[PDB]
Ligand binder design. Structure first.
Ligand code: HEM
Ligand SMILES: CN(C)c1cccc2c(S(=O)(=O)NCCCCNC(=O)[C@]34C[C@H]5C[C@H](C[C@H](C5)C3)C4)cccc12
Length: 404
């Protein structure tokens, strides 16, 4: 624990550890929910991980994300050293600078692009599932959750499939380091990989994501190689960790709820609604901002330079905006959440993600309508900037499956 700063009131202290919260064994969402019990203030200070603020209610979380003037993305991660080193684009920029870079990225992952890659998305899902179907078992996270999104990125970025193993490796070191290299090294390794492709597509442009970004213009002038690699880095990692883990949370729930499986099988038209409800219940991201100056927020004095965690995960779990928040109801009428963020940085891949989720639910239940958690298995969760599932062993009787 770090020594409490003089300007911080002792009665607002609540030492929550975002990387190792208590009661994690009861579920990661449930663990963060402790920040929402009646005896916990709307805004608290934890002495963990260097010391920082934490907004615990949807109201404050949304407000801080809207106000970039006071809450800057220049240092969006906790601990400070990590946020300071972070330089991906446009996640580490504030408007107006961010505006142009965000518009360019929107061109490679926006809705229009989704509708065009869908055949490959649906095709990829079916291929992956059919290959597992006969087995009667699988480790969902390793066998589907991971391969699905990374193959989608290779397609949109126009990269060859033989590069997946190496990219998977580099991305794994940027969140699950084995020791071979430290973030910075993996980043450079990634940049080393991207720079050549970028320079080459500058003169020989294709219709892929890299081509578009490489030939982009900002501030009336051509984007630099430095800016291009920093944007491409995000385009790669942005849709991995999030999708892999979200799909895992979703499948873990369905594996433990036969009635919900049956609901979607009998009422397929409800899958898009089911997707939104799962996004609320199993929200998983939590990054933050840094104070640009001294500022009084909701009766609390914030000091310039202070870091504040604004858990996107917590908004939809706030009992003040969603009744019985831990209950999953595909018929819930006013599903509110900030799972994809809020404000100027609202997730650009949100449309792609939903398509990935919906296609997955539809194609999996079509071929493997009945499945369960492997007997004796005890699912483990992990907590951080992007919380998730360690592994998810599933089992089923092939006799109940169907090839389509
Ligand atoms: C279940 C999946 C997803 C979730 C929960 C999610 C979540 C988020 C969140 C919360 C942010 C904003 C962070 C902040 O304000 O600092 C964001 C940003 C972003 N996401 Fe996603 N994401 C998902 C998938 C995707 C996908 C599929 C990609 C595509 C490569 C992607 C690309 C981006 C990009 C480009 C941004 C930065 C936008 C900006 O700074 O202007 N995301 N995402
Ligand atoms: C557990 N502790 C100690 C850590 C271990 C290893 C790396 C860490 C890092 S790190 O080096 O910055 N690595 C992780 C983050 C890099 C990849 N992800 C992204 O940019 C984001 C940017 C947006 C917000 C979320 C979700 C998605 C969009 C992708 C994160 C930060 C904080 C703690 C870390």
């Amino acid at each position: 624990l770090a020594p409490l700063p003089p300007h911080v009131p002792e009665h607002l202290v609540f030492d929550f550890d975002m990387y190792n919260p208590s009661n994690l064994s009861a579920g990661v969402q449930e663990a963060w929910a402790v920040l929402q019990e009646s005896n916990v203030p709307d805004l608290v200070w934890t002495r963990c991980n260097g010391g920082h603020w934490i907004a615990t209610r949807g109201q404050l979380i949304r407000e801080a994300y809207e106000d970039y003037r006071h809450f800057s993305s220049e240092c969006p991660f906790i601990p400070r050293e990590a946020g300071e080193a972070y330089d991906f684009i446009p996640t580490s920029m504030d408007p107006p600078e961010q505006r142009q870079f965000r518009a360019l990225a929107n061109q490679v992952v926006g809705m229009p692009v989704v509708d065009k890659l869908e055949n490959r998305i649906q095709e990829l899902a079916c291929s992956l599932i059919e290959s597992l179907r006969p087995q009667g078992q699988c480790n969902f996270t390793e066998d589907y959750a991971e391969p699905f999104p990374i193959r989608i990125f290779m397609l949109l970025a126009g990269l060859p499939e033989e590069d997946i193993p190496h990219l998977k490796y580099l991305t794994d070191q940027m969140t699950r380091p084995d020791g071979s290299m430290t973030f910075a090294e993996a980043k450079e390794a990634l940049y080393d990989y991207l720079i050549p492709i970028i320079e080459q597509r500058r003169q020989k442009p294709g219709t892929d994501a890299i081509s578009i970004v490489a030939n982009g213009q900002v501030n009336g002038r051509p984007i630099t190689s430095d800016e291009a690699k920093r944007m491409c880095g995000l385009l790669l990692v942005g849709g991995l960790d999030t999708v892999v883990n979200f799909l895992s949370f979703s499948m873990e729930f369905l594996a433990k709820s036969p009635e919900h499986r049956q609901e979607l099988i009998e009422r397929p038209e409800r899958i898009p609604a089911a997707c939104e409800e799962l996004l609320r219940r199993f929200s998983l991201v939590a990054d933050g901002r840094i104070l640009t100056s001294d500022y009084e927020f909701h009766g609390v004095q914030l000091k310039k330079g202070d870091q504040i965690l604004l858990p996107q995960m917590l908004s939809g779990l706030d009992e003040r905006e969603n009744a019985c928040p831990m209950h999953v109801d595909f018929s819930r009428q006013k599903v509110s959440h900030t799972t994809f963020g809020h404000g100027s940085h609202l997730c650009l891949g949100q449309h792609l993600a939903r398509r990935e989720i919906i296609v997955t639910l539809k194609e999996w239940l079509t071929r493997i309508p009945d499945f369960s958690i492997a007997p004796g298995a005890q699912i483990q969760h992990k907590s951080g900037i992007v919380s998730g599932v360690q592994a998810l062993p599933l089992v089923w009787d092939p006799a109940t499956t169907k090839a389509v």
